[PDB]
Amino acid sequence: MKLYMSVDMEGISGLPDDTFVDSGKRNYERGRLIMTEEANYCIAEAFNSGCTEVLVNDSHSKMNNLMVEKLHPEADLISGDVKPFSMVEGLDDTFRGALFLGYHARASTPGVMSHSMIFGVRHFYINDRPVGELGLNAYVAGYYDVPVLMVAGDDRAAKEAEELIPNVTTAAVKQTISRSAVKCLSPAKRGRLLTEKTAFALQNKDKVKPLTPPDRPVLSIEFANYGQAEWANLMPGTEIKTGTTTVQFQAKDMLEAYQAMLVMTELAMRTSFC
Amino acid sequence: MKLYMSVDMEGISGLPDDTFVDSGKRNYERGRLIMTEEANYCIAEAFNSGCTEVLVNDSHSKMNNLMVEKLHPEADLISGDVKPFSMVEGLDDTFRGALFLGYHARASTPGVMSHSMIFGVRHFYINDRPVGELGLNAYVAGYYDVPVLMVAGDDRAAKEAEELIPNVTTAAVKQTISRSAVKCLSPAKRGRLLTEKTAFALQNKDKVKPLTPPDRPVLSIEFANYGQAEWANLMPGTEIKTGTTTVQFQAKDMLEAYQAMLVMTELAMRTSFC
Amino acid sequence: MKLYMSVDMEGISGLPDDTFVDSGKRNYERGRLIMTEEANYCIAEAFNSGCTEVLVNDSHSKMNNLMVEKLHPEADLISGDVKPFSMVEGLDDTFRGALFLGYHARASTPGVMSHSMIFGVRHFYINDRPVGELGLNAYVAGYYDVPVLMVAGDDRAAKEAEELIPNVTTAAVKQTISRSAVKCLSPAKRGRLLTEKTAFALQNKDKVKPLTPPDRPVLSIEFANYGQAEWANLMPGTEIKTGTTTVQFQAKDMLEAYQAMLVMTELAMRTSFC
Amino acid sequence: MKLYMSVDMEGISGLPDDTFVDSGKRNYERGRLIMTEEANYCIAEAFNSGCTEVLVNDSHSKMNNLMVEKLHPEADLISGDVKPFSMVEGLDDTFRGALFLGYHARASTPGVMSHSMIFGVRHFYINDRPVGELGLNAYVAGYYDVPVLMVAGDDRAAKEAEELIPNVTTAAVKQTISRSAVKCLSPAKRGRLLTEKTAFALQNKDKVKPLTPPDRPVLSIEFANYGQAEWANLMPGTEIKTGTTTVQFQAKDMLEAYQAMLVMTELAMRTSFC
Amino acid sequence: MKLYMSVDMEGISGLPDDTFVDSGKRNYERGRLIMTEEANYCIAEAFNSGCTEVLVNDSHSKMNNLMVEKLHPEADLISGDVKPFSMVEGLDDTFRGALFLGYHARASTPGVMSHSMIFGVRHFYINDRPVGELGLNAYVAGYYDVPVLMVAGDDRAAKEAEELIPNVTTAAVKQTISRSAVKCLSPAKRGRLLTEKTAFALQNKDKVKPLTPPDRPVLSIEFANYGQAEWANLMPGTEIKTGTTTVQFQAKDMLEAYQAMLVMTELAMRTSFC
Ligand SMILES: [Zn+2]
Ligand SMILES: [Zn+2]
Ligand SMILES: [Zn+2]
Ligand SMILES: [Zn+2]
Ligand SMILES: [Zn+2]
Ligand SMILES: [Zn+2]
Ligand SMILES: [Zn+2]
Ligand SMILES: [Zn+2]
Numbered sequence A, B, C, D, E: 001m002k003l004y005m006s007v008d009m010e011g012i013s014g015l016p017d018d019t020f021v022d023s024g025k026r027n028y029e030r031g032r033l034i035m036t037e038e039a040n041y042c043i044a045e046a047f048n049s050g051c052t053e054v055l056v057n058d059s060h061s062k063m064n065n066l067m068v069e070k071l072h073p074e075a076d077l078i079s080g081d082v083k084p085f086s087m088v089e090g091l092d093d094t095f096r097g098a099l100f101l102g103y104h105a106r107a108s109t110p111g112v113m114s115h116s117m118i119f120g121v122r123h124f125y126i127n128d129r130p131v132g133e134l135g136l137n138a139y140v141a142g143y144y145d146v147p148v149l150m151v152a153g154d155d156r157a158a159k160e161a162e163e164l165i166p167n168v169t170t171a172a173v174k175q176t177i178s179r180s181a182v183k184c185l186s187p188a189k190r191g192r193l194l195t196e197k198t199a200f201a202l203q204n205k206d207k208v209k210p211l212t213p214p215d216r217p218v219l220s221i222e223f224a225n226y227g228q229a230e231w232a233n234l235m236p237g238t239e240i241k242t243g244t245t246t247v248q249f250q251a252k253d254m255l256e257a258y259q260a261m262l263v264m265t266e267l268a269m270r271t272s273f274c
C-alpha cells in the first residue's frame, strides 16, 4: 500500500520559534536534522505496518529542508520548490492514505507559529468554510479520494485536524503556550508517540473518509491589508469583496482552486509597506 | 484664536510610496521637504485668517520629519517622539479647532499607504465604531471639546473624515489608485487647494462640532495575527475575544483609551515571525 | 483636448546604460532629472498646441522616477506602482490621443537597453503578432479607441513604432550603437526635436488610427528559460506549448490580456538559477 | 511530586561574561551546552529523589537556550518567549516546590552580570521591599503557595536568596570577583555540588515556606534614566514619583503586578539615547 | 572684557533627539550648522555689548562640532577633545564671565536628552549637592572667581541653572515634552531671544556671583549599574559606598575633582553588558 507524506516544519517537535525553521537563522541546521529524524519515525513505522511505498514531500518554505542523506533510504523524497501542487505535490488517487507531519495551526488562531502559506493571509475559505494549509491540503487529498489518516504537530494543529476530519488520528508532539513558545516532549519521547500514532492510524484507516471538496469550489482569501488584496486581485477571474480585504476566485475544481491560492498568495507576498 | 495642527506624512501631496516617508529610504529627504512646505501653506493661511497661534505637531513615525529651519517662523513646532499623547500631543481645551494634515486611510481599507499606527493593526474600535488614526485623534480632540475643522490627505482619507465628522472640510491633495500609487496635483496646485480649504474651514468653523467620545470608552484592537494579540494581551486590564485576534480594554476615559492604544500597539510591534 | 502620456526611462535622451535608470545606481538621480525635463518639453508643447489636459503616467520600474516637484505644474502626474494597468494606467476613451516617451526596443532585438517588462521575456505575442511594451500599450490604447500619436525614444524604438502604427510620429532622441551604448543629442537639441515632433503629432493626429486589438486576444509569452515558463504556467487558464518556453493565455479582451501579462511576468520574475 | 524549574543563564557555572549568554556572541553555543548539562544534574537528582514530574522553563532572554535534544528525556521543557508569565510560566499550585537555576544578583548590587530583566532597571519593589528577578519570581511562586526549595547561581545570588527566603537551600557554583569575572568550579565539581544541594533541598523541603505576596501589591520600578520612566509611564494605571525615575503601579494581585512588570520593562527597553 | 563660552549640543534650539547630535547619525550635519549659528547670535551680541574677546569652547562629544569656517570670525574657537578640563578648557581668572550655551538637564531628571557626561552616570555630587554638567562647570568657573552670567538650553536646563546660580540669566530656546521631544522656537525667533538675553546678562552681570566650590570637595558619582562603579573604583583614591553604585573621591580642590570626574566616567564608559 502506498502512503503519502507531507512534512512541514513549524509543527515539528522541539521547535519553539522561527530560528529553527528559517534557513537564514542560527538554529536552522539543528531544525532540519530534527525534522528529518521526525519523519523517519513515521516512515519506519509505515513500512513496519505493511506499506510498500512511502512518498515524502518536503512542504516547508523552499522545501529543501529534509536531508536526503539522512532520510530513510527506502523512502522516496520530493525536494525543491515551484512544484505544480506545492505541499501536496505527487499525491494522486493511487495512494492508500495521507500523513501530515509537522503541521501547525491556521492563521489568526492560537498555536505556535500559526499562519497559512504566507504571513499575509488571515483566512482561507473553501465555500465559506474556514481552513488553513491543513484544510486545503486535505481537500486536495479528497479530490483524489485519499483520506488523511494522520496529522502530527502541536496540540492546536491536532485539534484543528480532528474538527475537520472525523476519526482522524492526531499526534501532538508539543503543547502551544504562545505563538513562539511551547512545552515539548524529548526527541525520543515524541518518537514513540509518532511511532504508536502512525501504527494506529494505518490500522484504523477504514474509519477515516476522504475530505471530499465541492465540485466548483469558491476560494476566498482574506489578507492582512488592502495592498495584498489588490495584488492578488490582479489575477484574472478574481474580485475583491467591497468593504473587505478578501479576494474571491470561482474555480472549476479543487485543483484549480489550489493553484489559484498559490498564485494569489505569491502576488500578495510582493506587497510593500507592511 | 489658537489652531492645533497634526501633520502626518503618508497623505502628503505628491508622495506615492514609502520611499518618501521612511527615514531610511532614498526619497525621504525630498519627502520631508514637501511635507514641511505643505504644512506652511496651511499655517500661512491660518494666520492670514485671524489665528493668533498655530501649534504644529509632527505626527509621523519618529516625528522628527518637519524641518524646524524651514517651517513657518511664526508657528510653534513639537518635534520628537515618546510624547504622552503621540499624534495629538499638545492639544487641550484652549484651542479653537484642529487641522489634520497629510492624513491617510485607516487599515484594511482602500487608500494609499493605508494603515493604523503600526502595520500590525487591522482595526481600531471605540465602542464598536470602526476608526483609524483619524478617528482616534478626532475623539481625543472631542474630549477637549475641540472640533476637527479640516482634514487633508488623499481622497480616501477625506471620505473617511467626512463620514465621521459632519460638515468637516476636506482637502484631497491626491487621488488613490493603489496602496502605493496615486494621481497627484502639482506642489503649487495642491498649495492653492490647501490655502482655499484652510480659509473656508476657519470661517465655516461654526458648522462643525467636536467628536464627543463615550464616558468610559471600550477600546478594541484587531491585530493581523494572534501573536500580536498575545503581546498586547500582556497589558493589565486587557482580554482577548475568543475566536479572534482582537484585544479589548475598558478605559476610564478617552485619554486613557488613547494611551492604552499606544502601549498595546507598541507591544504588538515586537511580534516576530510576521 | 485630453492627451495621455506614458513615460519610460531607457529611451530617455542621453541615457546610455542602466546606471542611469536603476534607482540603486550611481547615475540614477541625474537620470530622473533628465527624464522629468524631457517630459516637460512634450507637456509644454502639448498645452501650447491646444491640449487642455495632460495626464502623465510614470511607466518605469517602481514608477516613482518623475519628480513631482519639477514636473510641469499644469500636468497631472500618476506616480507609484501596483497600478491595475501598469504602463497605461489612467488611459480611457476620453483621451484624444496617447504619447509614448522614453520608450525602447522590445526584447531580443537591436536597441539600447532592449527588453519587455522583465529581463525574463524574449517575446510578447497578441494573436501571433510580435510586440513589446510599445505594442501591448498601443493595443490597450486601441481598446479605448485612442490613437498613439507619437512615440519617442531611440532610433530602434521609433522604427518599431512606425512598423506597427501607420503614420505615427516618432522622435529619435538618440542612436543605438549597442545594448549599452548610444550616440545622443544634447539635452537642448533633443528638446527642440521633441518640441517640433510633439507639435506635428498633435496637428497631424487625424492621419493616425487606433491600434484595434482582437476581440478575444490570445496572449503568448516566450520566456528565456523553462523555469520562468513553469512559474507563469501556474496561473489558471495558462498552458505551455510543448517543446518551447512559451506560455499561452486565452483572454476575454485586451484588458484581461494585459493583466494576465502583468501576473505571468510577475511570477516569472521569481525564477531562480538564472 | 511535581517540581518546577526556572533556568536562567548568567548564573550558570563557568560563565564569566556575556559572550557566553548573548546568542549573538562567540561563546554562546558553549554556554547553552553547559547550561543544558547544568540543568540535567538537578533534573536527574530530582527524579532520583522521588519527583515524578519536572517542568523546566527556559527563563533567559529569548528562552530558546536549553537544548531540547540534550535535556533529560524524562523532563518537560518550556521553550520560547512571549509567555504570559515569562520566567515563571507554567508554575501553578500543583507543584511541590520550585528550583531556580543559573540565577544572578539583582540590579545595582555586587554579583557577576547583575541586572533585573532589562539593563534599564535599577530596582524592583513589591510594597517597598527591594527585589530582583529572584524576588519577583519567588513572590509569584508564593501566590500559588509553592515554596522556593533551592536557588543556584553565583555566591551573590545565593546570599540574596537566603536573605529573602528562610531556610532556602543555595548552591554557589561560582564566586563573583567583578560584574564580568568569577572564580568557578570545574563542570564536574559544580555537578556534585548541584546534585548534593538538590537532594538536600528536596528532603528538607518542609522547612521552607512560600514567599506569600501582599494581597494588592504595589509594584515600583526605578529605571536608569528618566526616558525609560516616561515610556513605562505610558501604561494605564502608572504614575511617576516626582523627583525620581521611579514608576509605580497598584496591582490587583501578584499576577497582575508581574505582567505589569513585563509590559513596563518592555516599554522601557525602547528608550533611545542611552 | 573677556567672555568665556561653553557650547554643548543637546540643548541647542530645534534639536529634538540624538539624530541631530550624534556625529554618526542622519541629522548631525544640520545639527552642527544650527549649533554654530546659535553660538554666533551670542558672540555677535557679546561684542556688540562691549566684550573685546570671546573664547568659544566646543563642549560636546568629540568637540569638533562647531564649524570653524562659519563661526564668528572675531571669536577664538577651541576645537578637539582630550582637553585637560573638557567642557571648561581655557577658562581662567582673566574672564569677566561665562556663558553656557546649548545646555541640557542633568541625569535622572526631566528634560530633553538629559544626562551627565556619559549615559552611565545617574548623579554627580559635590559635597552632597546634586549637580550635572551645568553644576560642575559652574563650580570650576567659581574656582577662578568667574560668574556664570547666562545659561541657554531647554526650559529644564534653565530651571536647573537658576536654582543653583542666583540672579543668573537663562534663555529657554525650547520646551521639553519628553526626553526625545520638544516644542521649539523658529531659528530666527530663538536668535532674538538669545540676542536679548545675552545683552541683559552682560549688563546685569554685577548681580551674579561666582559659584564658589568647597576647599577640598568630595566628588561622588552614582552610576547606573555596579559594573560601572567597579571600573571607576579602580582609580586610586576612590571608594565605593557599600550598598550602592556610588563611588567617592576626596579631592584637593575643584580642579582635581573635575579631572577625577573625567577619569572615573571614562573608565565607567568601558562597562559591558549594559
Ligand atoms: Zn505550514
Ligand atoms: Zn512551513
Ligand atoms: Zn498615520
Ligand atoms: Zn504616518
Ligand atoms: Zn520599458
Ligand atoms: Zn523601463
Ligand atoms: Zn536573569
Ligand atoms: Zn538571564
Ligand SMILES: [Zn+2]
Binding pocket: E008, E009, E010, E104, E117, E133
Ligand atoms: Zn552635555
Ligand SMILES: [Zn+2]
Binding pocket: E008, E009, E010, E059, E060, E061
Ligand atoms: Zn553634549
